[PDB]
């Protein structure tokens, strides 16, 4: 069946494990190790036909290693993430889309901006300014909670669609 190869992206603390663990595995994790890099598979069902995810969630210390490198250059489509209550986490989202430009040596990536943590009331980051970014990149941009699942589904199936248009 239909394979796709995703990476999910963004600072260290902005939730990319968990909504990894929450996609794959319907659970909200508080306490998973920052220093792990891992892949994930699942097989959903989006629009109808059935398709295997599987997903790099992924660790600050592996940015620049060549097994890293190899997934960039494999993967497909992106998820770049930042926290909404973490201002600097927003300010990171370009290095992390420079980075997916330069390994696939492309402007025409899927992407989706995702930003995450929407159930926290201390927000320091306005979805104006996330809608702004995301337009400036040609991207959509999906607000999400690893904790309540808003928007889980929609964040990695919208990048899913992106990439079997690109396709
Ligand atoms: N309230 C809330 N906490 C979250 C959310 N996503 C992640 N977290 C928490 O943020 C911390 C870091 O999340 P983690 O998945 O380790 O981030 P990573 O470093 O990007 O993998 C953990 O304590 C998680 O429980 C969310 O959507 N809502
Ligand atoms: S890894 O051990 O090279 C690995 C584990 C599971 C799946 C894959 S993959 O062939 O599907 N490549 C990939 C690339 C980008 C994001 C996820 C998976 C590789
Ligand atoms: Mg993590």
Redesign the pocket.
């Known amino acids: 069946m239909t394979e796709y ?3 999910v992206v963004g600072a260290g603390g902005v939730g990319k494990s968990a909504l990894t663990i929450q996609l794959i595995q319907n659970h909200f994790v508080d306490e998973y190790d920052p220093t792990i890099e891992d ?1 994930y598979r699942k097989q959903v069902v989006i629009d109808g036909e059935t398709c295997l995810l ?3 969630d992924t660790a600050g210390q592996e940015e620049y290693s060549a097994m890293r490198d190899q ?1 960039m250059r ?2 497909e489509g992106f998820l770049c993430v930042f926290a909404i209550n973490n201002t600097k986490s927003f300010e990171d989202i370009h290095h992390y889309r420079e980075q997916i430009k330069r390994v696939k040596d492309s402007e025409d990536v899927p992407m989706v901006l995702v930003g995450n943590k929407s159930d926290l009331p201390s927000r320091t980051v306005d979805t104006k300014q996330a809608q702004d970014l995301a337009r400036s990149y040609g991207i959509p941009f999906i607000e999400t909670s690893a904790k309540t699942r808003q928007g889980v589904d929609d964040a990695f199936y919208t990048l899913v669609r992106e990439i079997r248009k690109h396709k």
């Open positions: 190869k995703l990476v892949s599987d997903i790099l997934y494999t993967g």
